[PDB]
Amino acid sequence: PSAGASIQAAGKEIDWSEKKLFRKAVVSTVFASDQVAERLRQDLP
Amino acid sequence: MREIVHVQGGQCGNQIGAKFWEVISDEHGIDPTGTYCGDSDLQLERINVFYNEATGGRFVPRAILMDLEPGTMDSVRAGPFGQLFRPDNFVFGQTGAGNNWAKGHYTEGAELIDSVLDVVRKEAEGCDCLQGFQITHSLGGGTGSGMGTLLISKVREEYPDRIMETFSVFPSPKVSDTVVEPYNATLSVHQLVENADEVQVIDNEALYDICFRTLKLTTPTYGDLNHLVSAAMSGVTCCLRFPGQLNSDLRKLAVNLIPFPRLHFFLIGFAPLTSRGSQQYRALSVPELTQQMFDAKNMMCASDPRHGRYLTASAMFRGRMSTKEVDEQMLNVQNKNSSYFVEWIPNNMKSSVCDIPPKGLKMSVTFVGNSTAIQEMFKRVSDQFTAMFRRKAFLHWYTGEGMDEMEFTEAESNMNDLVSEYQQYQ
Amino acid sequence: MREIVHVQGGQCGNQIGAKFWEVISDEHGIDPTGTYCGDSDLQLERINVFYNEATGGRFVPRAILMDLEPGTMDSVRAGPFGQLFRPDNFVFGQTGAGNNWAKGHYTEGAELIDSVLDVVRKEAEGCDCLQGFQITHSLGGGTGSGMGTLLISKVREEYPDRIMETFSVFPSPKVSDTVVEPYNATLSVHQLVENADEVQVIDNEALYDICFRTLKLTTPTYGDLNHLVSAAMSGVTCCLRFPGQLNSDLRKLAVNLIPFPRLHFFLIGFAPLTSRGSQQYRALSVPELTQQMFDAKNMMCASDPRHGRYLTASAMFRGRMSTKEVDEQMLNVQNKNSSYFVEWIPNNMKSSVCDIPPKGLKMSVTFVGNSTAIQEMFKRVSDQFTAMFRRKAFLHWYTGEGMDEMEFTEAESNMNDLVSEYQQYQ
Amino acid sequence: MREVISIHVGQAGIQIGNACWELFCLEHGIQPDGQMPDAFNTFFSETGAGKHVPRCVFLDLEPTVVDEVRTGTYRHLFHPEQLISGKEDAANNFARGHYTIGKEIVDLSLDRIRKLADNCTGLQGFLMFNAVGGGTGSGLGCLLLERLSVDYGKKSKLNFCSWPSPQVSTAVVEPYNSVLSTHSLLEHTDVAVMLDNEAIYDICRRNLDIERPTYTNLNRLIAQVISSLTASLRFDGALNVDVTEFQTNLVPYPRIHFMLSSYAPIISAEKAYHEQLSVAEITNSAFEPASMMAKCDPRHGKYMACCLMYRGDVVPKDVNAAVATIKTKRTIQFVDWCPTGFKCGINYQPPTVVPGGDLAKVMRAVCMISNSTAIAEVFSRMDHKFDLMYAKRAFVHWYVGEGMEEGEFSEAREDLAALEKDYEEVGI
Amino acid sequence: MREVISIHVGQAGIQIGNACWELFCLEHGIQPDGQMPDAFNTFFSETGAGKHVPRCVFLDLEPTVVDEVRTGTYRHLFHPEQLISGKEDAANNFARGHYTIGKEIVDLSLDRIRKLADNCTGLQGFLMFNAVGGGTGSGLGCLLLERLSVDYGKKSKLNFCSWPSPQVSTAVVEPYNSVLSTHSLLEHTDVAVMLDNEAIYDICRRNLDIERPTYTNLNRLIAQVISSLTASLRFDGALNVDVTEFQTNLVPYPRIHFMLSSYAPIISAEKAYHEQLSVAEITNSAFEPASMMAKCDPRHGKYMACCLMYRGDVVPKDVNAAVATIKTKRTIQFVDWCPTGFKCGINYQPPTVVPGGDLAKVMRAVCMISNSTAIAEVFSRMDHKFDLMYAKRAFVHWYVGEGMEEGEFSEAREDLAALEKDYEEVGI
Amino acid sequence: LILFPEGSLKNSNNTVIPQSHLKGKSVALYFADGADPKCASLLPFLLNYYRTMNEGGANQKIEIIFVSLDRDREAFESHRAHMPWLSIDLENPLTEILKRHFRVMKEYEVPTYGYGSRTGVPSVIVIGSDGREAQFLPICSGLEEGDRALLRWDWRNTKFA
Ligand SMILES: Nc1nc2c(ncn2[C@@H]2O[C@H](COP(=O)(O)OP(=O)(O)OP(=O)(O)O)[C@@H](O)[C@H]2O)c(=O)[nH]1
Ligand SMILES: Nc1nc2c(ncn2[C@@H]2O[C@H](COP(=O)(O)OP(=O)(O)OP(=O)(O)O)[C@@H](O)[C@H]2O)c(=O)[nH]1
Ligand SMILES: Nc1nc2c(ncn2[C@@H]2O[C@H](COP(=O)(O)OP(=O)(O)O)[C@@H](O)[C@H]2O)c(=O)[nH]1
Ligand SMILES: Nc1nc2c(ncn2[C@@H]2O[C@H](COP(=O)(O)OP(=O)(O)O)[C@@H](O)[C@H]2O)c(=O)[nH]1
Ligand SMILES: [Mg+2]
Ligand SMILES: [Mg+2]
């Protein structure tokens, strides 16, 4: 019985933390405005 | 005081809603941490129109972001100005509304409408009195035409005394995104005409033509369309939040611009718009802003207003300006091309001035009109609908969720006699 | 001047009063050893209502830990805040009930009931004049529903004027844990209905959906339910410990909640309940706490109040507040709900501002209401009872330890007699 | 504190106990010399300087299976006086074990059982590990259990039987002595958990990937079964199940108490890391028809009560979710007098693994023990088997020789004929 | 969250799965063991400490390709018992895959996909990959979709067939196999795109200059197609679509659900350098009447619906303007009643190239899933290939002597002919 | 303690590695004979298994050390040129000490070392830190299942720590 270093099978560390209603989302250039944001701002470079 | 509940729905609805809070927060000095960096009383003297203080100096918005699919909630929250809303108001489904009106209005939206209605009555019954709701759904697709219009019937019968404005995005059949657009459009007109009082039709062909021909941008994206729409969105409710000489709430737009209670689909266009070069050559004054808003390559509907007539109109002038030039310029347009302005209404339009201009600008106009050229919108989608319904095209889904053959014939009828009610006032 | 004698029954009772004696002890500033370690002189005023002072400066709780399994109090005495109790009132059995109602109320509980009634009356007879007793009995099991309810019968005759307020945990069928929970529950009801004063019913099912749909946590333990009930245990006894602007004790909750002398069973809520994400975005003032109080999801019973009338109530607000936002929101919800409110009573609401909130919290409230909508949770158990008992299933071990068959058919004869009684006031 | 005196009879019971007492030693770490290099007081009795001695009485009328464990590795753990042995084997014969060769050993076995039942406070049950397939297991098992009925009347007396499996049968007289032992299993036993060889044959090939296991590999599975059953008594955890409430949630009528069993995470370590053993996965693998360790399709007969022994790191709420998963499934049927049909227990320490065995590490396991009406055709298949040899009375002269008045076969015929007749009488 | 079980049946279905579960592994970052050095939720259930496993079953009634994956590189990416095999295959016969050898494999496969569907309720649909030109692919694939309808029914069942080619068939009995399996292909699947082999040979003969391609190259182009339909099913994107949004927007009538597929650009290193990839350029090469991947000229028919999956560095107005130029060309016709026949979906993630493969590192790609009346041609070649052999009952004694009887061959004829009259009555 | 001294452990192309180059890996000895039909049948399976394990991953997971039970040095090198993993020279008495420690002999038993149980040829056996046995892969044993008992390996729970 000296073999006590037998690591657990199936990586089951059940989620003690709260759930995540939000998953990662890459910020997209297509839904980011730019362009007309500075055209409706009278920038005058 | 008077609060405007914002009832974003669908992928198009939440994306234009996020940019709407991106153009209202920068006017109100709001950081996306709820704080206020600014030095004017004028930004918080009426902060209760769109923002609610929650016990920590944070002005969380009144926005009820919904859909039936778990994707575009994540894009908004992780996006810019995203960590400003309330996650309880991020009410969503888990399945996918696959451009199907039947399972957005009748079956799948039925088990989510009760939870969304709880959220909207949460932030609407606790106030002094609400001025009115504000939906920004899209009238093409599954949950925009579905879940978006389903609540419109439910909260109309719950509050049948208040203004209900809808920045609906009509489908573009010239070049489109789906095939079942005619079904998702005709089955949403007949309940947007009986349970709504200010529709604001927005086409994507206009959003693409006027960003490229007027603004002279080679490739401006979806968020660029969102900022163009949301610029008009802020300019309709400018007078509610910011003070002005001739103020105008949403009900003031309705009382002056609705000839008959069924004729309430409105054109809308924001009309200072110069290109990258012409920002230093154009002259910002009231006559030049007046000429732009009647010019058809400023219009955000892509139904040409000079093919029809003008029952009535309006222009929310926004900025410091002299008020004679507000109203003497409007008979310059009413007397020059009087072939459009109809004869059974003298001085067809409603002017208004809110003193605070939008950010960066000095003077802006938000032209809203009721022209009988939107009957061309209901004409080209009628062409799409009668070609498909005559051959029972794409039907087994819709008859699959229980809704049957009969209500197409009054969906066509409610749109056809709406065209006939625009023929006999031009 | 007032004293409460607390007895914990069953493995549920000795683990829900294990956390109750944690939450009320740091509310009075008590070390695990027993010394006073607090920040306010407003902790050491009514220590007498839950504690007895010992030699040396060490307060000992008035807690009789009552069970027949010895292993439960071994874990309590080894866990935190369990060595605070006096060892001589750890009245432990060794045989233990087999989740039988006969095991405790007729055999192998009756020899030990003299051991528990002697230690109960030792704490009880030493008093100025006590309010009464609180018992955390656990309908569905064998010891809390068994010998714990015989404590309810055999304390009522020695103290017939002192209150018999009692917290209960009924067995919900989808969170069922023992097949004979129908037999244990309905045998524990028909004795509790004639010997009790205030039965605060709690369900494990509705403890799950308040932590899954409001506290926003998926499967992270069972002790989350114990702490949520333990806030409600101390929220009702706010005036017996701390001063209040308006005062109400449990005898106040007797006259203003029980209309007729068989209307005992009450519904319990607690509603400053905020999730992790909505912590920054939620206003913790009085209007947002009176709406979650009456939110049917927040109630700790799966016995939906919208499916029934609503006789009386008591609003136990706990935090420094103005009384003139307590009570207009009582009449606001009473006018705006209307039909879900009994009609032969003008005001169905009670209010009592307690001046000192629990630590962390600025402001709290605990619902104690008497609604007819506990009829469906009772009738749900009665459907279970008529399942096995119609053919006499699982019955040869309730008749082998004493009992005849007559007390089973009497347990249902006064069961449906009560649910009909709750029903016809609707 | 608590203790459960184990009584093993027959070579199957002895070899099963060689794996069960193997595994109890390594759960709470106890070396074969008794020494450890309050939880041990469920199967061990501390006496002296760390000399933990088991609570068992070995029994066999032949000196071959228990002399061999005297010379093995447990000469010192198993203290050498309760390893009761005889000389003449009962030879697959009920009339030998229940009669002439066997009264000499009941007297000494009852002595050491009485010494083991009156040396620790509040004994809690008797786990018998018998073998109804032969001689000493069935014959001495029946006589001994009939004496415990009067010596301890109020007493819980769980059994663990190896019933003759349908196609596998290593002795031809198994159908006789199986029916002859129903008299000892119908009115003298509280819990009758049913095991047989060929179902634990199949449970190891398709799940543990051993195509040639042995009775060691079988008895490791049985040792896992009773370890989960007695894990709540020995150890601590939320919502414990005692032996006192074990039969209270499984035995509806005093005569129908024949249960079954299924384990769940029986996977070798290769295809155990490749599956996430969730609560819903292991409970549906438990209710799988092929996971019963009896030839019993649990679909020709409706369930009556279940006892799902979860153990390890399991939360008490997703157990309710997975139970609700089973309830809504139409392939797992229930009968109409049980809107609730589950009593579940939960331990906290993980299901142990034997170093050198066929199992892996999991901190979860469902040892569900269920009392269904589908146990009836296990007995009724033996009814047709018994009648085919009794018609012209072969293998009978031995029984009639050492006892067995002709008519005990007839009363055991009608005893087991009344047994399954109760079963379809209950479920309608 | 969202997930699809990818059933891989037959021998060609396994060989497609060998290519798809290499491109998907490179796309998600999964090692051949399973660890990584939350988009991995539609394909890879997290069964470990970073150790993923595909939600797929490898199914072939012949053991030789199943064991070859079991001894290959991805022998630990896959759970060992997900790879279900038999011993005798079906050899080129519908009724062997459907009846005799199919008893003993459907019970364990449908059990396994039940244990792959219980990990989440939010399953989008099932995929099934087969070759309807031979024994196991058509034979077991028919019986699989039969029983899949009596289990989860509203759940979508897609299909990526490997239909016989005009002159390429590499079998002699294949018109009997293909025609007689159309019944499962017409009443039990929802999306039924055709993919014959020598169209893909033509793709890597004109656009890749490979005069000597193998089956492993064809599977790579198929795997790139599967990656681009389910690119939206795991990632972000401007326009997001799931599997039910395909069917509602591409299938006009319930019987008309056989699709065609194209993918562009299929280009290599010597080509990609001298050419500018603009959205109009890729959609032009996708719409040309030779890039169709099952041998069906769209000029000999009328389009009914068209789904395009833009993927990578693509802006929406380059989609929205170049789709107009397609509509203006007279060589392509939409029939009468779909003058919005275009479902465009935009992703951000570029198509990942398998290193040392045959494709470039293109930043933008389109896959076509289109419906047309032109695919009366792909089923009418089976009309004179089946009926001309069937005139005097060729290759019939295998099928009738093995369970199926004569007459079911007749039933397949009006099943295909009712499909043929259906496509000609819709487009007029 | 030390199992393999400084000059004992040599891999392919004859470079000696010390004990330091072996942690983090699942280590087995492999007692095999050159002329033995069991070994000749088992060796391609061991080669393929070793190649798949130690090629498809982010770490070198398993590792095998050869020990010859053959007759001479030419038979050593003829066997040795076929395996790529570690090995011990036959003339080192370390092989004989491992033979006596792990009981893997070849029926020459009473002439020198007359104890009992035998565990014959071949034997791949996984080892640990202090040279203790961990688990036996049952090629020729009580399970006697050949050419697939290599799959009974447990690399995660047996590591040379
Ligand atoms: N599970 C299991 N069953 C066994 C084992 N050994 C024997 N059996 C079964 O026991 C049944 C017969 O009982 P035996 O143990 O062989 O003999 P007995 O009960 O001691 O009585 P005798 O016949 O007098 O030796 C057979 O059906 C065997 O299948 C074992 O090690 N494990
Ligand atoms: N695309 C593709 N098609 C293949 C491949 N291998 C075989 N096919 C096609 O499959 C058809 C023959 O069926 P197979 O897939 O070989 O085998 P089967 O129909 O599943 O029946 P079995 O051989 O018994 O398993 C022929 O039309 C082949 O052209 C492949 O690797 N890729
Ligand atoms: N103007 C604009 N249109 C959008 C946006 N997102 C999507 N759309 C349009 O919405 C149509 C597709 O509808 P969809 O979003 O799928 O409907 P849903 O079911 O409500 O999600 C397409 O024509 C898009 O052009 C946006 O951010 N702005
Ligand atoms: N809320 C709560 N419920 C519990 C707790 N412990 C057990 N329960 C449940 O309460 C029910 C009552 O059982 P109980 O009488 O206490 O068990 P017994 O002491 O063994 O007779 C059981 O079915 C448990 O599921 C706890 O700590 N808190
Ligand atoms: Mg034996
Ligand atoms: Mg083939």
Distances in Å between the Cα of C257 and the Cα atoms of B326, C131, C168, C329, C350 are 66, 17, 18, 19, 9
Residue found by looking up tokens 């070390």 in the block:
C31
What are the residues facing E85 on neighbouring strands?
E60
Q: Are E115 and D281 in contact (CB under 8 A)?
A: yes
Spatial distance between the Cα atoms of F1 and F128, rounded to a whole number of angstroms = 11
Closest chain D C-alpha to A9 CA, distance in angstroms: 5
Peptide linkage before F122 cis (omega within 30 of 0)? yes
3-state SS string over B320-357?
A: CCCHHHHHHHHHHHHHHCCCCECCCCCCCEEEEEECCC
For residues B199-232, b (16+ Cβ closer than 10 Å) or e, as one string? bbbbbbbbbbbbbeebbebeebbbbbbbbbbbbb
Spatial distance between the Cα atoms of D383 and D273, rounded to a whole number of angstroms = 44
Question: Residue D193 has what DSSP assignment?
Answer: E
Peptide linkage before F84 cis (omega within 30 of 0)? no
Active site residue D245: yes
Residues of chain D with Cβ-Cβ distance to C100 below 8 Å are: 245, 248
Residues of chain D with Cβ-Cβ distance to A9 below 8 Å are: 267, 269, 272-273, 360-362
Burial of F131 (0-12, 13-18, 19+ CB in 10 A): middle
What are the residues facing B351 on neighbouring strands?
B315
Spatial distance between the Cα atoms of D63 and D101, rounded to a whole number of angstroms = 14
Number of Cβ pairs closer than 8 Å across E and F? Answer: 21
Spatial distance between the Cα atoms of E371 and D349, rounded to a whole number of angstroms = 59
Spatial distance between the Cα atoms of D249 and D232, rounded to a whole number of angstroms = 15
Q: Cα E230 vs. chain centroid, distance in angstroms?
A: 12
Number of Cβ within a 10 Å radius of residue F102: 18
Spatial distance between the Cα atoms of D354 and B168, rounded to a whole number of angstroms = 68
Enter the tokens of residue B133: 């709701």
Please report, as a single letter, which amino acid is at residue B232.
Answer: A
Which protein residue's CA is at the shortest distance from atom 9 of ligand 3?
B12
Q: Cα D222 vs. chain centroid, distance in angstroms?
A: 7
Number of Cβ within a 10 Å radius of residue E211: 7
Question: What are the two backbone dihedrals, phi and then psi, of residue B43, each rounded to the nearest 5 degrees?
Answer: -90, -15
Question: Residue A24 has what DSSP assignment?
Answer: -
Please report, as a single letter, which amino acid is at residue E397.
Answer: H
Residue found by looking up tokens 């490898």 in the block:
E58
Question: Residue C141 has what DSSP assignment?
Answer: B
Q: Which of B301, B19, B10 is nearest to B172 (CA)?
A: B301
| Residue of E146, E245, E288, E420 marked active site | E245
Spatial distance between the Cα atoms of C378 and C68, rounded to a whole number of angstroms = 27
Spatial distance between the Cα atoms of D285 and C36, rounded to a whole number of angstroms = 54
Enter the tokens of residue C82: 């369990």
Spatial distance between the Cα atoms of E134 and E15, rounded to a whole number of angstroms = 15
Name the CA dihedral angle for B385, B391, B394, B396, rounded to a multiple of 10 degrees. 130
Distance C262 CA to ligand 4 centre (A): 26
Spatial distance between the Cα atoms of C59 and C82, rounded to a whole number of angstroms = 13
For residues B53-66, b (16+ Cβ closer than 10 Å) or e, as one string? ebeeebbbbbbbbb
Q: Is B56 annotated as a binding residue?
A: no
Distances in Å between the Cα of E213 and the Cα atoms of B306, D399, E210, E221 are 62, 79, 6, 12
Asked if E245 and B99 come within 8 Å (Cβ–Cβ), the reply is: yes
Kindly state if the Cβ of B211 falls inside 6 Å of ligand 3.
no
Spatial distance between the Cα atoms of E88 and C59, rounded to a whole number of angstroms = 81
Residue found by looking up tokens 């041990």 in the block:
D40
Asked if D277 and A10 come within 8 Å (Cβ–Cβ), the reply is: yes
Spatial distance between the Cα atoms of E125 and C381, rounded to a whole number of angstroms = 40
What was the structure determination method? Answer: cryo-EM
Spatial distance between the Cα atoms of F14 and A9, rounded to a whole number of angstroms = 38
Spatial distance between the Cα atoms of F51 and E31, rounded to a whole number of angstroms = 15
Alpha helices in F5-153 (DSSP H): 37-55, 73-80, 94-102, 110-113
Pocket of ligand 2, beta carbon within 6 A: E 10-12, 15, 60, 62, 89-91, 131, 133-137, 162, 164, 170, 197, 215, 218-219
Q: What DSSP string runs through E129-192?
A: E--TTSHHHHHHHHHHHHHHHHSS-SSEEEEE-----SS--S-SSHHHHHHHTHHHHHHS-SEE
Spatial distance between the Cα atoms of C388 and C402, rounded to a whole number of angstroms = 20
> Interhelix angle for C71-78 vs C10-23, to 10°?
20
For residue A26, the chain E residue with the least C-alpha distance is: E236
Distance B358 CA to ligand 3 centre (A): 26
Question: What are the two backbone dihedrals, phi and then psi, of residue D370, each rounded to the nearest 5 degrees?
Answer: -125, 145
Q: Is B75 annotated as a binding residue?
A: no
Q: Are B138 and B144 in contact (CB under 8 A)?
A: yes
Q: Cα C72 vs. chain centroid, distance in angstroms?
A: 20
Burial of D405 (0-12, 13-18, 19+ CB in 10 A): exposed
Q: Which of E252, E211, E265, E284 is nearest to E373 (CA)?
A: E252
Number of Cβ within a 10 Å radius of residue D379: 20
Spatial distance between the Cα atoms of F7 and F76, rounded to a whole number of angstroms = 18
Q: Left, alpha or beta for E100 (phi > 0: left; psi -120 to 50: alpha)?
A: alpha
Q: Which of B145, B87, B148, B151 is nearest to B121 (CA)?
A: B151
Which A residues, 7 through 26, put their C-beta within 8 Å of a C-beta on chain F? 7
Distances in Å between the Cα of C127 and the Cα atoms of C48, C59, C116, C131, C239 are 9, 15, 18, 10, 18
Enter the tokens of residue C395: 């019955």
Q: Which of C354, C294, C356, C349 is nearest to C327 (CA)?
A: C349
E411: number of CA atoms within 13 Å, CB side? 9
State the closest ligand 4 atom to the C-alpha of C202, by its place in the atom list counted from 1: 1
Please report, as a single letter, which amino acid is at residue F78.
Answer: S
CA diameter of chain C: 63
Between A11, A24, A28, which is nearest E49 by CB?
A11
Spatial distance between the Cα atoms of E404 and D162, rounded to a whole number of angstroms = 45
Enter the tokens of residue B164: 């209900």
State the closest ligand 4 atom to the C-alpha of C229, by its place in the atom list counted from 1: 1
Distance E92 CA to ligand 6 centre (A): 7
Spatial distance between the Cα atoms of B21 and B7, rounded to a whole number of angstroms = 12
Asked if B393 and E338 come within 8 Å (Cβ–Cβ), the reply is: yes
Question: What are the two backbone dihedrals, phi and then psi, of residue C305, each rounded to the nearest 5 degrees?
Answer: -65, -20
Q: What DSSP string runs through E184-246?
A: HHHHS-SEEE---HHHHHHHHHHTS--SS--HHHHHHHHHHHHHHHSSTTTS--SS---HHHH
Which helix H or strand E contains B306, and what residues bound it? none
Q: Which residues of C touch A (CB under 8 A)?
A: 216-221, 275-277
Q: Which of F66, F65, F58 is nearest to F27 (CA)?
A: F65
Breaks following residues of chain E (C-to-N distance > 2.5 Å): 37
Question: Residue B63 has what DSSP assignment?
Answer: B
Enter the tokens of residue C32: 């695990």
Residue found by looking up tokens 């789906």 in the block:
B178
Q: Pairing state of beta strands F9-10 and F86-88? A: antiparallel
Spatial distance between the Cα atoms of C28 and C241, rounded to a whole number of angstroms = 9
Enter the tokens of residue E119: 């990990």
Residue found by looking up tokens 């108001």 in the block:
B89
Spatial distance between the Cα atoms of F14 and F80, rounded to a whole number of angstroms = 11
Q: Are C415 and C186 in contact (CB under 8 A)?
A: yes
Distance D132 CA to ligand 1 centre (A): 8
Spatial distance between the Cα atoms of B29 and B16, rounded to a whole number of angstroms = 20
Chains E and F lie in contact, requiring 3 or more CB pairs less than 8 Å apart: yes
Q: Which of C50, C62, C347, C278 is nearest to A21 (CA)?
A: C278
Chains that touch E (3 or more CB pairs under 8 A): A, B, D, F
Spatial distance between the Cα atoms of D301 and E322, rounded to a whole number of angstroms = 65
Distance C372 CA to ligand 4 centre (A): 26
Asked if A31 and B223 come within 8 Å (Cβ–Cβ), the reply is: yes
D249: number of CA atoms within 13 Å, CB side? 33
Spatial distance between the Cα atoms of D377 and D295, rounded to a whole number of angstroms = 9
B239: number of CA atoms within 13 Å, CB side? 22
F157 reaches E (C-beta below 8 A): no
What are the residues facing C137 on neighbouring strands?
C168
Asked if B221 and A35 come within 8 Å (Cβ–Cβ), the reply is: yes
Spatial distance between the Cα atoms of D46 and B56, rounded to a whole number of angstroms = 63
- Nearest bound ligand to the CA of residue B300: 3
Q: Are D384 and D272 in contact (CB under 8 A)?
A: no
